[PDB]
Design an enzyme around this catalytic site. Sequence first.
Site, mmCIF file in Angstrom:
data_model
loop_
_atom_site.group_PDB
_atom_site.id
_atom_site.type_symbol
_atom_site.label_atom_id
_atom_site.label_comp_id
_atom_site.label_asym_id
_atom_site.label_seq_id
_atom_site.Cartn_x
_atom_site.Cartn_y
_atom_site.Cartn_z
ATOM 1 C CG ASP A 73 60.789 39.163 36.923
ATOM 2 O OD1 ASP A 73 61.729 39.013 37.728
ATOM 3 O OD2 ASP A 73 59.910 40.039 37.053
ATOM 4 C CG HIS A 126 56.147 37.516 35.390
ATOM 5 N ND1 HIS A 126 55.350 37.524 36.514
ATOM 6 C CD2 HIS A 126 56.937 38.611 35.480
ATOM 7 C CE1 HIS A 126 55.641 38.583 37.248
ATOM 8 N NE2 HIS A 126 56.603 39.258 36.644
ATOM 9 C CG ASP A 154 58.034 38.297 39.619
ATOM 10 O OD1 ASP A 154 57.679 38.109 40.798
ATOM 11 O OD2 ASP A 154 58.209 39.433 39.136
ATOM 12 C CG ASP A 184 50.968 36.522 40.203
ATOM 13 O OD1 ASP A 184 51.173 35.484 40.864
ATOM 14 O OD2 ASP A 184 50.208 37.434 40.581
ATOM 15 N NE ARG A 185 49.758 40.924 33.745
ATOM 16 C CZ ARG A 185 48.534 41.377 33.501
ATOM 17 N NH1 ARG A 185 48.082 41.544 32.267
ATOM 18 N NH2 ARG A 185 47.740 41.674 34.522
ATOM 19 C CG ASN A 208 57.006 41.587 42.608
ATOM 20 O OD1 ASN A 208 57.979 41.153 41.992
ATOM 21 N ND2 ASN A 208 55.967 42.147 42.003
ATOM 22 C CG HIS A 209 54.113 39.170 40.297
ATOM 23 N ND1 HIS A 209 52.856 39.461 39.816
ATOM 24 C CD2 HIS A 209 54.902 40.207 39.936
ATOM 25 C CE1 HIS A 209 52.883 40.625 39.194
ATOM 26 N NE2 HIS A 209 54.113 41.099 39.253
ATOM 27 C CG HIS A 242 62.080 39.368 42.665
ATOM 28 N ND1 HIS A 242 61.885 38.656 41.503
ATOM 29 C CD2 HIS A 242 61.077 40.275 42.723
ATOM 30 C CE1 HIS A 242 60.828 39.131 40.871
ATOM 31 N NE2 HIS A 242 60.314 40.109 41.594
ATOM 32 N NE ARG A 280 58.081 48.247 40.491
ATOM 33 C CZ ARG A 280 58.101 47.457 39.428
ATOM 34 N NH1 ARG A 280 57.046 46.737 39.082
ATOM 35 N NH2 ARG A 280 59.209 47.381 38.697
ATOM 36 C CG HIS A 325 60.236 43.555 40.554
ATOM 37 N ND1 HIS A 325 58.927 43.127 40.502
ATOM 38 C CD2 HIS A 325 60.204 44.805 41.069
ATOM 39 C CE1 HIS A 325 58.138 44.085 40.954
ATOM 40 N NE2 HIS A 325 58.888 45.112 41.308
#
Lengths: 580, 299, 432
Positions: B57, B59, B85, B88-89, B117-118, B167, B214, B241
């Site tokens: 990740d 991110h 990822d 996303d953030r 996933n993101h 991932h 989650r 992840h």
Amino acid sequence: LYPIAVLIDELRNEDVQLRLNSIKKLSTIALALGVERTRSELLPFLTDTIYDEDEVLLALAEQLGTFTTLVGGPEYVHCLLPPLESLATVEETVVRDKAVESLRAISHEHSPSDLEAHFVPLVKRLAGGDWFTSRTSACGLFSVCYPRVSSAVKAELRQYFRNLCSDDTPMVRRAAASKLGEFAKVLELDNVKSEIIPMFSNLASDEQDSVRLLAVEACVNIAQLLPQEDLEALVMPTLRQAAEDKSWRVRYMVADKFTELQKAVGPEITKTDLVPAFQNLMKDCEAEVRAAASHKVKEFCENLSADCRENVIMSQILPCIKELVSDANQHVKSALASVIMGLSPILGKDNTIEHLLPLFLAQLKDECPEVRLNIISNLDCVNEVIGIRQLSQSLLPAIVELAEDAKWRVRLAIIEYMPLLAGQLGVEFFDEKLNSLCMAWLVDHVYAIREAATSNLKKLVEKFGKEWAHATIIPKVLAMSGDPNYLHRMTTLFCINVLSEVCGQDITTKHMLPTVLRMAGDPVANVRFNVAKSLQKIGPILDNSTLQSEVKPILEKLTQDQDVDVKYFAQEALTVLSLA
Amino acid sequence: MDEKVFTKELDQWIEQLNECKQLSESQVKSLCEKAKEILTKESNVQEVRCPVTVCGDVHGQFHDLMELFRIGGKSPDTNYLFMGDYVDRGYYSVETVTLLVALKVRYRERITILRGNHESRQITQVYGFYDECLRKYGNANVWKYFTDLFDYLPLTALVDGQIFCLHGGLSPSIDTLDHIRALDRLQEVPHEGPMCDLLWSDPDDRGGWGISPRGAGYTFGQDISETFNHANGLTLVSRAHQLVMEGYNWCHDRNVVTIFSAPNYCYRCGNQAAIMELDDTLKYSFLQFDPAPTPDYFL
Amino acid sequence: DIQWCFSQVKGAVDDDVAEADIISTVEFNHSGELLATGDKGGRVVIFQQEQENKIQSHSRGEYNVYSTFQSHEPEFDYLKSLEIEEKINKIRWLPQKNAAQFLLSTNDKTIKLWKISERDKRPEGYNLKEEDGRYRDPTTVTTLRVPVFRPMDLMVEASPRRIFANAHTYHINSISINSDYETYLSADDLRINLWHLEITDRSFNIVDIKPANMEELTEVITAAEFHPNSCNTFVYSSSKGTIRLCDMRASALCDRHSKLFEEPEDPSNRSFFSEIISSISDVKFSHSGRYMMTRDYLSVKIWDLNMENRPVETYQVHEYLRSKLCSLYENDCIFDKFECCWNGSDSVVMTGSYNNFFRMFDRNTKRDITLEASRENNKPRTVLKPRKVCAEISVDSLDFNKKILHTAWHPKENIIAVATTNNLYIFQDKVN
């Protein structure tokens, strides 16, 4: 014509981006309309137009500042006042700040009659409004109209500013404290002492500590206007009450501005009052205040009185520095370490060796990476003042032990310091102790360290000559070409690339060229196309015979490989060398 | 002719991106089109040869990604393999994803950007990619082309047939790699099934399949990973992840490894980052890098 | 005697409502002319008081609808697979910057800064198109004309200015604006973040009570209010009765409260609910800042800011339920979070209760009054009797669903807004 009408219609649009673009191109609209039309029907459309977002209003406020030539010069600039007065009242602080800035910018085009008739009334209207945003915007419009109005208008402006500083909303007082230093610069000295000093003292003892921490900058800007004799009676008591303030933010501001304070108040007042203040700030119970005070240690000690500079340093500041070195906070140590080394030339060689050297060792062996990084970054300051014959006995073991530490930034710092350090030690002694260090850097598990050691190898070669490289450095470099980890083979290629230009033509032809040619058969395509890049880089120094005889067949053979990258990097290697 | 000048443009774009400066809408459009054209030929399991540098990740953290490139080397010199990822953030999600996609386009045989996933229209709207994209571009265009480029990203990667890099985690409906091959990845991630679990799953301590904390995907125990490894004939299942304090973690008795390469995640966990380097000796050399060099109002 | 008469009511046309009109908070403006009520569903309604003319005085103004906007839309966080509730938690009116009106409305995760502006003029005209939107050819227009703002009927619009999100991993329960016009705090169950009113990307966490192991939760923050006069002092309650008064002059991180207001517990004064009924529901500072209010489930305590170990005045709201607390533990109705409010001059204290009741304790005269908020039994031009309880009306006749969980008081008048389950009631004293 048609695009200009599109822009005019585009001022009133549902798309924020298109409206913002139309407003940003307001100069063309005004040019097409004409001065009279802009004064009569475009600008009044821009006064009631406050319905937009932050960017649109900010762009409008920025554009209105450069509009004084488009409305008809400095005579009709008063017609630019209603839109900016409306913009200074908005809720956004960036839009308010830009409206204030544009009002100040166009305030220099007002004639003094036009000043006192249109802009001074605007300042009074903004400072006497019912919205505290208007007064917050008015706080910044007193320093641009004061030096150009009459005495009566000056007195009215001073009264309005005094009312602003004594407001009830904290934002207005906090905005007036910021502009108190600016307003005091355009006043008269008698007026300064009579009016600003009560204002500055009242803002410095405000109920809100967010208005108190601007009185520090007010004091800095005021002490530069009063005579040295009047500081003790007017400014110094308030500064003393501000250094010993109850809120840590005011003390932090005092520590942050301490160097400017020492410059402003004159050296005698520093040596008398500020030195105890500096000691008490460096022993503050607050970590951030201590860090801010330690950030200024070397600057304050450098700007001290020359009559007893080193004496007062050793007598007063040194124990507090010895305490700050052993501090329990990471930031305080990291801030003192980056500035402590500059204290060495002031104290001299003997005082450095006696007192500072244990501190330097304690900070080099500190558990915090930032302390060590900063000490190595500033080591040259002490290396220049204590020479090289005295450095090695106390400092060299620390560098050798720390060149293999965990954090790779510290290793990188030592790599950058290594060429300059080893230049003063000569080839004879550097080979025995530090050559192994510089070679072990090349195998480091961080590519940044490998590249740094490669550049340092270039620097060492250019400092010591080519014979030393050919005898002790180059064989070690080629020794890595058989490494099972292909990253290190690429590292060997990089070293050959950075050594080709500096080690010499015949030596490149005879020693490192065969390995570059041979590594073209590596079963990793990365090494193959890096061999292609290396051959392209090295080509210019080779002679025609060796090039066309050996490099051309090997580089050409790379143009039949299956990998696309090798093909491309050999193709744009034949052409750049004009071998196609 | 056209290929030469296009490669020059790609190189200039990567060079500009390296300076933290974003691209233009037209440039992002062309980059996404070319990346989709390249990625449509990559299977659901992308067979990639050693040596490789498996990253996890990112991110959106762009300076942290630059630190990553400073630890393991730069492309195309170092062969990378990212698994999800990139958005996303992250405060610079657009620059991160644009740089990774440009590297994939320009060095198609050196990079392998997997799908996380993101990376989907659902996630990218709520967790600061749509908002950042609007802040940096003013429209939902380049966000749209990024998200429908995200469709063609491969789901898995097979390093020399022995390291299985995905991932997320294993699926209850998937037993062999051929089942992953049979999946249709030319769509957004579903809320259930094999494709969602290949990016949303998590390894746990209890044996057997389990419910994810989650709420999306499932969890697999040690015996699931052991069965998968002994059935597919591969020695390690690499993944990402999951936030790991040490940057990398070993699970299920050294059967799978989590590589989370975004340090100081959440800015208050203080986690380090790790990348996993492979040579033809297949030695796993894990590098780590934590750094990347009161608030103003309360100062 | 003080007569409190029904003034206004807002509610649905029918008597069947869902969980999207239950009033979730009520908060007056600083000047009291406005009144916001953010019911569940993120639907904030702003009630403006009818303008009192300086010529007519025989009737006071009622609160008519002035604006309505959806503060929070339903949201779903995918990384945890729950639904972010759209319920409005706390509304806080910012002091008036300009002619617009500001308020912080918070759901369980986000805080928004809404601007309630008024439009009375709109642009009329186009160069290419017509005044209605029908396009025209550019071959018939040669002179450029700019739009002219023409007056239009008053229209109120609300637009979010700043959104403070992604900084609270627990349910945000309280916000409070600092007395310095540039910052405020938001408190979730286990930490407090200090935000800047114009910086949305960063929050400086000033209080953290999260334990290392989440299995040892002994205290959760249930309220947090700044000081009305001090730029730095702020208090925050807890679920164990502790009342910590932080003072941000001391250190950057407020790991050590300057004071701790707490009543020492004794075994002789506790049987089984010492740990449960002692949780503070909301803490309100006095308008002068000298005193402070904290409302637990059954008692109202007024602390002096100097005395840190004993409440100055204790008021019992529904002590006549103490015999039925056990019955309140099985139906999950003891965990209600009532809210207290101060007088405009800190002379009278008022807080809600069950069965459309809300008590009014007089600080000076020590006389208490219990009023009722209902409309099916009140008629125009009819006096209202102060209701009484038997500790007449029995204790089993209390409708435990018709609770008053939200109250507000006019800043400079005697108007109080009492929000029932569905209908918002406004009480106003009658002065002839």
